[PDB]
Structure 1
Amino acid sequence: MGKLSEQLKHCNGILKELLSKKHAAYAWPFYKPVDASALGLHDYHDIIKHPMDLSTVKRKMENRDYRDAQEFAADVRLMFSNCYKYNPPDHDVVAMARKLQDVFEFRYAKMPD
């Protein structure tokens, strides 16, 4: 219930942007947990030990799980890293990850301090 810190307000803003229609053309693979069984990716959980996605990040922010911006950023980067680990580098989903990570990194760099 307590107010997010100033840095976590900035993080929440970024999160809102990543989930916004503005970026939907490349963000949509990251909206929800990878459903490995549904997608036929029966090796996914053998390869990715720590799944992460934007819905999970949103829930953690709402629940005040993140104690600082660094913790938030680690989860967003984990999400991208998982994509880069599992998928061949020339896959369309990787191109989408790179584009969304560019959005993330450039706005994260504008953190107040």
Structure 2
Amino acid sequence: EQLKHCNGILKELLSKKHAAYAWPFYKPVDASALGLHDYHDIIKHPMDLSTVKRKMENRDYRDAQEFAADVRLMFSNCYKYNPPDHDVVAMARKLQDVFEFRYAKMP
């Protein structure tokens, strides 16, 4: 019911319209490839949109709140790991505003 609306939100976050700032969240952070040695010490519970998508498809979310908690975890990890002036942080804030807008307007 509210879960079905969550699918629409996720689709919005992954759509072309937001690609210029969403693209770094499309896949799990690869610490080795990016050369962030300490990412997995600092970030204990990694998250990204393709993981949210899988969990949605497998019906791992029992309600809208659990879905929101994973999306917020993704943004929180980013703010936690990266300095406040980093470009990826500015990208996260823009994507999060889209997310909090759609989540707040859900019936």
Q: TM-score range by the shorter chain?
A: over 0.9
Residue among 32, 39, 42 paired with 2:37: 42
Q: Distance in 1 between the 2:92 and 2:5 partners?
A: 21
TM-score, normalised via structure 2 length:
0.99
Name the structure 1 match of 2:58.
63
Q: Distance in 1 between the 2:4 and 2:94 partners?
A: 23
Q: Distance in 2 between the 1:107 and 1:71 partners?
A: 15
Q: Distance in 1 between the 2:43 and 2:23 partners?
A: 19
Q: Distance in 2 between the 1:17 and 1:45 partners?
A: 29
Q: Distance in 2 between the 1:110 and 1:10 partners?
A: 10
Instruction: Indicate the percent of aligned positions where both proteins have the same amino acid.
Output: 100
> What does the per-residue CA deviation read over 1:20-67, in whole Å, with 9 as the maximum and x for residues that have no partner?
000000000100000000000010000000000000000000000000
**Following superposition, which runs of at least 4 residues in structure 1 exceed 6 angstroms of deviation?**
none
Aligned length: 107
The Cα of 1:76 is off from its aligned counterpart by 0.1
The Cα of 1:111 is off from its aligned counterpart by 1.4
Q: Distance in 2 between the 1:111 and 1:67 partners?
A: 16
TM-score, normalised via structure 1 length:
0.94
Q: Find the residue that maps to 2:55 and give its secondary structure.
A: helix
Q: Distance in 2 between the 1:11 and 1:90 partners?
A: 30
Q: Find the residue that maps to 1:33 and give its secondary structure.
A: coil
More helix by share: 2
Unpaired runs of at least 5, structure 1: 1-5
Name the structure 1 match of 2:104.
109
Q: Distance in 1 between the 2:26 and 2:20 partners?
A: 11
